[PDB]
Design a protein around this ligand. Structure first.
Ligand code: JZB
Length: 207
């Protein structure tokens, strides 16, 4: 297991998301579904020029899996996934400009729900989660687990859990007072409100 420090501005964004008083937390689900949709668009796009990219799985979909016993909400997609370099470096690098644009916009009157307009909507997960684990598999690399409870650092390790073929699984370890996002009717409401036109099937698993 390797420990990395977030780029400073990203550590600052996560402190802001964690510490700002902001009741409209439900948007985190829209943002992560949107990220899954964008990851699915990428492998679909690349597959048109190279059909061998779907050898790791043709199905393009999103599953929502709540688990009251683990207090986890898991978003699973079969999109393009992330390499080790993606996890540690690339996405963080890309997110620098968006994080700065976002912080400035919040200075000028925007609110937290607008985060996804800046390409950094993943960090809205920390509105509801004390810890986030991401398992991912990209066609060009092995399976990895990334994890952070914020505080300025994250870790990455090889994952030898059940193999996933290709894609990303985001595991939201929910804060004690956010267990409403484990409820079936709450999840349906929010998907209906915010993610009505996503062009992949979203399956809400029940308990
Ligand atoms: O694999 C994913 O994107 C790969 C293709 C890129 C698509 C554009 C949408 C952005 C998505 C993401 N931005 O990450 C922000 C980030 O630095 N870190 C650290 C590494 C762990 C993931 C979060 C990662 C991602 C997220 Cl977050 C997701 O909820 C679903 C996903 O399928 C993917």
């Amino acid at each position: 297991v390797e420990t990395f420090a977030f780029q400073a501005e990203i550590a600052q964004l996560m402190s802001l998301i964690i510490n700002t008083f902001y009741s409209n937390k439900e948007i985190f689900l829209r943002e992560l579904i949107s990220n899954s949709s964008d990851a699915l668009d990428k492998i679909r796009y690349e597959s048109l020029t190279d059909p061998s990219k779907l050898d790791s799985g043709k199905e393009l979909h999103i599953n929502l899996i709540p688990n009251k016993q683990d207090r986890t909400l898991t978003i699973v997609d079969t999109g393009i996934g992330m390499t080790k370099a993606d996890l540690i470096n690339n996405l963080g690098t890309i997110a620098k400009s968006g994080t700065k644009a976002f912080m400035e916009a919040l200075q000028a009157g925007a609110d937290i729900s607008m985060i996804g307009q800046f390409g950094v909507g993943f960090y809205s997960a920390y509105l509801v989660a004390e810890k986030v684990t991401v398992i991912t598999k990209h066609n060009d690399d092995e399976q990895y687990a990334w994890e952070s409870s914020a505080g300025g650092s994250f870790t990455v390790r090889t994952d030898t859990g059940e193999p996933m073929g290709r894609g990303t699984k985001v595991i939201l370890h929910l804060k004690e007072d956010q267990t409403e996002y484990l409820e079936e009717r709450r999840i349906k409401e929010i998907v209906k409100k915010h993610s009505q036109f996503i062009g992949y099937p979203i399956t809400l698993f029940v308990e």
